[PDB]
Amino acid sequence: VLSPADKTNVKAAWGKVGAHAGEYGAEALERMFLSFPTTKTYFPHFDLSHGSAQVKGHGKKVADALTNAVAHVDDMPNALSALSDLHAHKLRVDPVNFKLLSHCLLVTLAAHLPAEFTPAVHASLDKFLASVSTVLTSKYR
Amino acid sequence: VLSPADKTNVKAAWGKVGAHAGEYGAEALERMFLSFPTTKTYFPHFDLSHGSAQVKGHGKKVADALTNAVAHVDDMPNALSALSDLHAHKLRVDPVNFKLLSHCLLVTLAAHLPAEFTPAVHASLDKFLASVSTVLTSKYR
Amino acid sequence: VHLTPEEKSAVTALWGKVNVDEVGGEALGRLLVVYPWTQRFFESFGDLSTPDAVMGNPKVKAHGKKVLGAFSDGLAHLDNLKGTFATLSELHCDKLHVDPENFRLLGNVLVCVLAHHFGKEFTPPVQAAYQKVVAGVANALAHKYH
Amino acid sequence: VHLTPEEKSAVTALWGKVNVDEVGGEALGRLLVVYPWTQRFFESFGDLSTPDAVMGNPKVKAHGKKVLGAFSDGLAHLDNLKGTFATLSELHCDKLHVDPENFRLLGNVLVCVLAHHFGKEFTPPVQAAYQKVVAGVANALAHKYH
Numbered sequence: 001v002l003s004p005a006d007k008t009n010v011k012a013a014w015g016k017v018g019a020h021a022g023e024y025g026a027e028a029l030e031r032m033f034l035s036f037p038t039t040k041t042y043f044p045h046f047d048l049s050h051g052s053a054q055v056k057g058h059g060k061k062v063a064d065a066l067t068n069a070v071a072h073v074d075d076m077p078n079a080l081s082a083l084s085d086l087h088a089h090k091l092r093v094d095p096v097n098f099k100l101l102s103h104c105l106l107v108t109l110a111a112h113l114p115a116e117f118t119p120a121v122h123a124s125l126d127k128f129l130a131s132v133s134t135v136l137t138s139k140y141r
Numbered sequence: 142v143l144s145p146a147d148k149t150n151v152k153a154a155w156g157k158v159g160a161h162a163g164e165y166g167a168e169a170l171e172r173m174f175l176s177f178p179t180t181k182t183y184f185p186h187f188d189l190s191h192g193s194a195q196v197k198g199h200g201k202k203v204a205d206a207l208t209n210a211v212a213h214v215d216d217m218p219n220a221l222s223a224l225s226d227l228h229a230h231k232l233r234v235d236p237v238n239f240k241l242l243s244h245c246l247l248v249t250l251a252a253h254l255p256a257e258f259t260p261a262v263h264a265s266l267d268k269f270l271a272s273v274s275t276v277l278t279s280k281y282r
Numbered sequence: 283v284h285l286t287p288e289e290k291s292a293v294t295a296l297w298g299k300v301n302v303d304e305v306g307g308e309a310l311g312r313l314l315v316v317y318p319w320t321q322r323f324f325e326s327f328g329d330l331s332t333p334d335a336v337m338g339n340p341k342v343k344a345h346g347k348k349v350l351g352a353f354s355d356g357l358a359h360l361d362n363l364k365g366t367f368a369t370l371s372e373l374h375c376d377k378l379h380v381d382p383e384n385f386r387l388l389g390n391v392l393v394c395v396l397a398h399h400f401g402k403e404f405t406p407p408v409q410a411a412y413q414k415v416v417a418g419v420a421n422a423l424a425h426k427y428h
Numbered sequence: 429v430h431l432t433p434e435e436k437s438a439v440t441a442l443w444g445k446v447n448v449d450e451v452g453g454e455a456l457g458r459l460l461v462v463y464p465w466t467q468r469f470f471e472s473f474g475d476l477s478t479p480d481a482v483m484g485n486p487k488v489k490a491h492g493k494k495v496l497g498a499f500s501d502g503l504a505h506l507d508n509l510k511g512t513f514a515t516l517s518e519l520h521c522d523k524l525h526v527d528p529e530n531f532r533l534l535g536n537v538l539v540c541v542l543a544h545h546f547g548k549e550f551t552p553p554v555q556a557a558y559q560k561v562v563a564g565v566a567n568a569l570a571h572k573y574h
């Protein structure tokens with residue numbers, strides 16, 4: 001479970017991202033597609049070349065859902081219910097992929113927020129992306 | 142989440158296991174030790190030879206715990222509370238290993254319950270074990 | 283596929299007793315029922331709404347036979363799974379867009395099916411040999427992904 | 429392991445600027461903080477009750493240096509990680525009883541640390557190559573488990 005300190009740690013880290021959220025989301029997506037090519041099989045309809053507009057636009061969407069998660073950290077299921085429905089019944093993404101995406105987010109954050117990525121913040125952010133993942137795969141069956 | 146149907150299927154399958162449970166647990170453990178050797182690193186103090194007493198004895202303890210969880214299927218987080226603290230703070234078994242044992246428990250049941258291991262039941266059992274695994278793993282950090 | 287001679291004959295011995303037709307259909311059907319999201323690849327197959335619809339679906343049964351036929355053919359070339367499966371690999375990646383994790387899930391579902399049909403005969407050691415075989419097969423189908 | 433020539437030069441170039449002292453300390457320290465269960469192997473290191481305690485623990489820092497020391501050797505043996513790490517695999521399995529899944533955890537942490545340190549310079553292409561090295565190292569350390 002996310003502890004109060006975790007919540008504080010995440011609201012803090014995510015605050016600095018501020019307007020760079022769409023950029024970091026896109027970057028994490030890109031890191032994911034190159035580092036773990038099997039993840040590309042869920043986006044056969046996307047132009048996946050560096051900096052193309054489908055990846056940019058999708059990046060913004062992922063990050064915004066994440067901002068929504070942070071802003072509603074104490075009530076994640078309700079807040080992310082619809083995304084949970086989408087991933088479970090429509091996209092049907094294998095759960096193993098949520099970890100690869102989460103790792104790439106963490107790498108992007110560590111690369112972009114040198115001062116803020118302390119070990120404790122690192123721990124909280126990881127636990128946090130795991131909680132989001134769980135919620136997003138909760139209705140699979 | 143486990144549905145009414147799932148709950149029904151689990152009570153029926155484990156209901157037929159009955160007085161073999163312990164032996165099925167020992168077998169499950171033996172299957173895990175041979176198919177996934179890395180799991181052995183958590184048991185350096187055990188004699189792992191076929192037919193071992195410690196195995197048979199640990200086998201029974203595992204089975205008793207699943208019997209109790211099924212006995213408290215609508216209150217599993219509380220019913221397993223103790224087991225959860227043990228695995229997260231003393232034993233500290235890496236989460237992945239829970240999937241390995243679970244798989245070996247299904248194989249063991251598949252081998253012993255021909256008529257009851259229907260597709261629908263296989264599914265429910267898989268969800269059930271995934272739910273147990275999640276409870277035993279919920280307080281890791 | 284570090285498979286010992288003892289492991290190799292055990293796999294083969296057992297495989298002899300297998301009815302490839304009914305086993306492949308059983309395995310693929312269960313795959314679709316136990317891990318429902320693997321249905322996303324087979325929308326053209328018709329009704330998959332309930333367990334019996336899936337398990338009894340003729341196209342599911344026909345496709346399972348296809349899958350197992352290739353697996354068998356793979357069991358005849360244990361020392362060269364990658365070569366044997368290379369074209370199937372390219373296909374599942376470039377044309378069909380199947381996440382390789384699905385190959386690992388099928389393998390485990392296949393092990394449950396074998397266990398289910400052979401009971402006692404599916405000893406822990408024989409299970410251990412098959413686990414190596416299904417990973418190897420999973421790995422071979424994954425190998426040409428890019 | 430299938431590392432591309434340009435991938436090879438990408439790994440090597442960046443490693444040339446890595447401060448083993450700092451980075452080894454950070455990686456091991458973070459491992460123990462982000463994944464608390466790993467602390468089970470280092471009870472004799474002393475106080476590990478808090479992040480500051482963990483990050484400050486000098487035995488943690490000394491052992492981190494040793495671990496990256498071995499990692500460095502691997503990078504000059506990329507074409508034979510298995511042989512280069514055979515002995516270390518044996519010790520981690522037979523004397524230490526370390527679940528290999530921990531190797532994977534360390535690799536990922538290692539990857540986050542390099543990013544934290546190099547920022548811009550740790551680009552997606554560079555990350556990709558390091559993900560492969562990290563996995564190869566992990567797989568080589570698990571190789572002699574039995």
Ligand code: HEM
Pocket residue numbers: 039042043061062065066083086091093097098099101102132133136
């Ligand atoms: C960190 C967890 C994730 C979050 C918060 C997230 C969020 C989102 C959002 C906001 C959308 C767009 C919904 C809309 O257009 O209204 C989306 C769609 C999608 N997601 Fe995820 N996602 C996550 C992980 C994943 C992963 C792991 C995969 C598989 C690799 C994936 C695959 C997809 C696909 C294929 C789409 C639809 C793309 C399209 O056709 O436009 N997602 N997700």
Ligand code: HEM
Pocket residue numbers: 180183184202203206207224227228232234238239240242243273274277
């Ligand atoms: C199905 C999920 C599991 C259940 C229900 C379960 C249950 C139990 C029980 C009842 C005990 C005995 C504790 C006591 O004496 O009170 C135990 C101990 C133990 N379990 Fe688990 N376990 C599970 C999964 C695992 C897995 C995945 C591992 C690691 C591979 C593991 C490793 C151990 C170890 C090392 C002990 C202590 C053995 C000893 O020192 O005597 N368990 N578990």
Ligand code: HEM
Pocket residue numbers: 320323324326348349350352353370373374378380384385388419423
């Ligand atoms: C044991 C591993 C597997 C083997 C050996 C195998 C083999 C095959 C073969 C021979 C075909 C026919 C190829 C063709 O049409 O030219 C095929 C098609 C296909 N495979 Fe696989 N397969 C495996 C696992 C999977 C699984 C796990 C999935 C996804 C869950 C999958 C998805 C598909 C799909 C969607 C088709 C095309 C079906 C259609 O014609 O509509 N395969 N596979």
Ligand code: HEM
Pocket residue numbers: 466469470472494495498499516520524526530531534535565569
């Ligand atoms: C990147 C992969 C790793 C490498 C290359 C590595 C390398 C080493 C080396 C060089 C030693 C010193 C051996 C000696 O004293 O002769 C060592 C010891 C040890 N390693 Fe690892 N290690 C790795 C990962 C791990 C991790 C993930 C764990 C568990 C979390 C672990 C647990 C241990 C333990 C408990 C010792 C003995 C420490 C002591 O002397 O108290 N290792 N390892």
